[PDB]
Design a protein around this ligand. Structure first.
Ligand code: ZN
Length: 19
DNA sequence: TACGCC
């Protein structure tokens, strides 16, 4: 629960995008 | 911000 690729409550994919 | 992708 958090990011998509990172693993932290920083943001979601539209704010990450980080592959 | 960058693949929402590996
Ligand atoms: Zn992330």
């Amino acid at each position: 629960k958090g990011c998509w690729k990172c693993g932290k409550e920083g943001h979601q994919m539209k704010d990450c995008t980080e592959r």
